[PDB]
Amino acid sequence: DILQVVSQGWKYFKGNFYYFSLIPKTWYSAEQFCVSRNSHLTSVTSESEQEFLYKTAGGLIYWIGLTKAGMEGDWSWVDDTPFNKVQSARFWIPGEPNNAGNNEHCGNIKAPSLQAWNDAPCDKTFLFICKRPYVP
Numbered sequence: 436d437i438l439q440v441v442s443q444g445w446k447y448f449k450g451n452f453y454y455f456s457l458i459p460k461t462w463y464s465a466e467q468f469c470v471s472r473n474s475h476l477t478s479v480t481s482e483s484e485q486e487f488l489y490k491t492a493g494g495l496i497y498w499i500g501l502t503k504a505g506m507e508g509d510w511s512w513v514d515d516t517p518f519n520k521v522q523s524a525r526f527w528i529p530g531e532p533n534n535a536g537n538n539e540h541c542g543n544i545k546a547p548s549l550q551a552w553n554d555a556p557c558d559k560t561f562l563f564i565c566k567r568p569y570v571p
């Protein structure tokens with residue numbers, strides 16, 4: 436139900452529902468909140484989605500579903516979308532990911548630009564964005 440979901444504070448964009456939180460959490464506690472609402476921290480897989488997210492974020496920092504996984508620590512999406520390193524290079528802040536302090540294994544939307552993402556420590560608290568597909 437689109438009207439029911441939206442009226443609980445979600446936004447509908449191109450077939451997906453998005454929740455922009457108002458309380459900050461660590462990355463995994465954010466993901467746990469998303470899981471409790473049949474969702475995950477958002478993936479980003481097109482310029483139009485990145486644009487919707489950074490514009491709605493409005494210059495505030497939000498965890499998204501970016502996290503390192505595997506033995507090599509390659510970036511991944513918690514909703515299990517395969518990570519496209521080539522397509523995603525345009526979406527990082529220049530100089531990121533930089534693994535500052537050798538402990539930045541999660542990702543957020545930080546800058547209000549198409550170049551928006553930064554890697555930050557997973558145990559830091561930020562606002563966060565859940566994403567849930569609409570299934571009619």
Ligand SMILES: CC(=O)NCCc1ccc(O[C@H]2O[C@H](CO)[C@@H](O)[C@H](O)[C@@H]2O)cc1
Nearest residue numbers: 530531532533534535539545553554555556
């Ligand atoms: C606001 C401020 O006092 N900045 C100057 C001191 C400083 C320098 C780096 C830093 O790390 C943050 O910024 C880095 C980019 O510079 C990010 O790569 C990193 O993930 C994290 O977001 C945090 C503070």
Ligand SMILES: [Ca+2]
Nearest residue numbers: 533534553554
């Ligand atoms: Ca960083």
Ligand SMILES: [Cl-]
Nearest residue numbers: 455456457458
């Ligand atoms: Cl919230």
